[PDB]
């Protein structure tokens, strides 16, 4: 909530909204080269928050987080953001193969709640030096990429109450077979991130 103030280039919430839009489509293209949801040939080596990250130079991409981080600050940012899934499901086999699931809380302003040290970025470094690594990393723990997987990106908002009705928590079933493990998660007294992604476990020991 703001009065006389417009949201073209604001720093109370965009400020903050900024971080974790510019967190959620680096980890998100980050993601594309671990998942390789396509040629990896489209990447683009970048240095942001104080680390170096890649990127998916797609157009099309680009253009699906782009309408999707205006929207996600619109639509997103109205409600508080909270939750984020994104499901890659192979489109050769139409089945699911790798979920990653990611938190994303955000606040409006700073009523009385000043942020640690002289910067409160740095958990962001920390997060987001994580979340690239993770994603890399458990790649590299996985094997090789093959088929053209299709992506399904979820966005989750709070409520007041309503009468509870929990979504993606309800029911056993999920995907089919795959395992679930934390990453990491990083909170900020104006914004908190997780971390978390599964993939699918062909019977192991």
């Given amino acids: 909530?703001?009065?006389?103030?417009?949201?073209?280039?604001?720093?109370?919430?965009?400020?903050?909204?900024?971080?974790?839009?510019?967190?959620?489509?680096?980890?998100?293209?980050?993601?594309?080269y671990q998942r390789g949801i396509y040629p990896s040939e489209t990447?683009?080596?970048?240095?942001?928050?104080?680390?170096?990250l890649l990127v998916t130079?797609?157009?099309?991409?680009?253009?699906?987080?782009?309408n999707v981080v205006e929207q996600l600050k619109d639509w997103?940012?109205?409600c508080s953001v909270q939750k984020l899934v994104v499901v890659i499901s192979n489109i050769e086999?139409?089945?699911?193969?790798?979920?990653?699931?990611?938190?994303?809380?955000?606040?409006?302003?700073?009523?009385?709640?000043?942020?640690?040290?002289?910067?409160?970025?740095?958990?962001?470094?920390?997060?987001?030096?994580?979340?690239?690594?993770?994603?890399?990393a458990t790649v590299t723990f996985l094997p090789l990429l093959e088929?053209?997987?299709?992506?399904?990106?979820?966005?989750?908002?709070?409520?007041?109450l309503v009468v509870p009705e929990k979504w993606e928590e309800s029911g056993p079933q999920f995907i089919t077979n795959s395992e679930e493990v934390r990453l990491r998660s990083f909170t900020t007294t104006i914004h908190k991130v997780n971390s978390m992604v599964a993939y699918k476990i062909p019977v192991n020991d």
């Fill in 43 to 52: 990447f683009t080596r970048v240095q942001k928050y104080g680390l170096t």
């Fill in 1 to 32: 909530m703001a009065l006389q103030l417009s949201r073209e280039q604001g720093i109370t919430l965009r400020g903050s909204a900024e971080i974790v839009a510019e967190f959620f489509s680096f980890g998100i293209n980050s993601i594309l």
């Fill in 76 to 78: 997103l940012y109205k």
């Fill in 57 to 66: 130079t797609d157009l099309e991409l680009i253009k699906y987080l782009n």
């Fill in 147 to 160: 088929v053209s997987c299709s992506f399904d990106l979820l966005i989750y908002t709070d409520k007041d």
């Fill in 93 to 136: 086999s139409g089945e699911v193969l790798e979920r990653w699931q990611f938190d994303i809380e955000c606040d409006k302003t700073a009523k009385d709640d000043s942020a640690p040290r002289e910067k409160s970025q740095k958990a962001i470094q920390d997060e987001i030096r994580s979340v690239i690594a993770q994603i890399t």
